[PDB]
Each structure stands twice: as structure tokens, then as C-alpha cells.
């Protein structure tokens, strides 16, 4: 479960960063 | 490995570029947390966040990117606490599905403060606050929930005793319940002030005029005044409430304007 939870953290954080990168 | 030294160089460029002390502190701990992490996926996220932060000049977005790097590096890999990974994911999902930058700031701040506290009562309070915020799309209600969760986690980080933290918890329930009834943001800010007063074991006097609601807090010392000011000012910024601050000796005077 820790592996699957850690994967979702990395995936969600990568999408949140590109979200902040596009919007100004 | 090689990313850790690059992260330190990227964090150093941000410190010299900007003058915001909160950005410089976030860049500092992002480099510290990354150096103590062996997970490559954690290092690539915080380096990706630092690189995009250098591509921007807006201090509000640089702080948000830095908060993502701090939260992921705090608990975003295996060999981390399973409950800390759950809270980290709740804040990241809530921030990704929200438009208001104050919701993104509040969700990341509340999560980071809960993980650093290592207090089980603070961990469950922030966890349940994040899930309650995800369950609704009322951005005004979400901002009040995050403000209460962050101020409560600060009390634990500051070292509030179990007895005083429990009294502060009753105000967290009261604030959230009052926000769901549509209470004015001024009264919600007054509840944050009351939460921090009971959480630190001091007293407060409220002089209500209807126009100038003034709160006088006595018995606070240096570290306690910083924690109180950080929690109240953070709540006011998330709720859009204008607040006037004046401190003198061991007394802090807070005026909550509509």
C-alpha cells in the first residue's frame, strides 16, 4: 500500500506542478 | 545523487533572486529534505518544482511550487509513515482540483504542519479536514476549513500540551460547524484567535462595538506571539478579512474589520 500511495503522491504532484506552471 | 547537488544550486538561485523570506525558508528546507531522501521520484519532483519556480517571478506561484516540493519530500515515498502519505495525497488532490490559490496554499500548509508535528491528534484533525474539504465544492467553506486546520497544526508544532490542544480542538469543531451555517468571515477569524488563546493557555478580552471588534491578548511571549500572529494572519488572508495588528510587551491587540 505504501508503494501505491507513494506512486499516487508523485503522479498528483507532477500534475499539480504543471497546473501551476501553465496558469499565471 | 546528482540531483541533490543540483537541487541545492537551484535553491540557492531562488534565495538570491527573491527577497521574500518565506520563499527563502521554503527553498532552504526543500534542499535539506531532498538531501536526506534516496528516492529518485521524490528528488525529480522537488527539482521539477524548483526549476519551474525559477521560470516565474510571481511570488504567489513560487511559494505554491515550493510547498509542493516540501510536502512531497516530507512524505512522498516508501519508508515513510503510511498515515503521513495519506495526508500528503489528500492535500495534493485537493490542491489539484481547486482554482483558488488560497485553497492550494492552505491545503499544502496544513498538511506540512501536521506531518512535522508528529502529534496523532493533529494528524487526524488535518486528515479529516482535508477529506471534508474534498467532499464539497464550496470554496468559501473550504478556505475556512483549511484555515482552522492549519492554525490547529501550528499549536501542535509549537508544542501545545495535550490538555490545551484538546480545548483548541473543540474550537476547530465549532469553527467548521459555524462555517457550514454561513457565518461571516470576521466571526470565523475571531474563532481562530480563540483557538490559539486556549491552545497556549492565556486569556483574551473581546471588546465588541459592531464596527471595531478588538481582541486584547495578554501573557504571550516572543515565540507565542509569532505562532499566534502566523495563524491569525494566515486565516485572515484565506478569508479575505482585513485585520490590524499591534503588540506591546506581552500583549497583542488584534482588530478584525469587516
Author numbering:
A (entry chain B): 3 to 26
B (entry chain A): 0 to 257
Quote the original article:
Several natural systems exhibit ‘facilitated dissociation’, in which an effector (E) can bind to a target–host (TH) complex to form an excited ternary complex (THE)20–26 from which the target dissociates quickly. We set out to design protein systems that undergo facilitated dissociation. We use a switchable target binder (host) and a flexible effector that can rapidly bind to and switch the target–host complex to induce a large steric clash with the target, forming a strained excited ternary complex. We show here that by explicitly considering excited intermediate states when designing coupled protein systems, a broad range of facilitated dissociation systems can be designed.
To investigate the mechanism of facilitated dissociation, we focused on AS1, the design with the tightest effector binding (Kd,H:E ≈ 10 pM). We used X-ray crystallography to structurally characterize multiple states of our designed systems. For both the AS1 and the AS5 systems, the crystal structures of the hosts alone and of the host–effector complexes closely match the design models (maximum 1.3 Å Cα root mean square deviation (RMSD)). The unbound structures show an open hydrophobic cleft in the new designed state X poised to bind the effector, and the effector-bound structures show that binding the effector causes the two switch domains to register-shift into the designed state Y. The two effectors make nearly identical interactions with AS1, but when unbound, the peptide is disordered whereas the 3hb is structured. Crystal structures throughout the facilitated dissociation process confirm our ability to design excited states and large register-shift conformational changes.
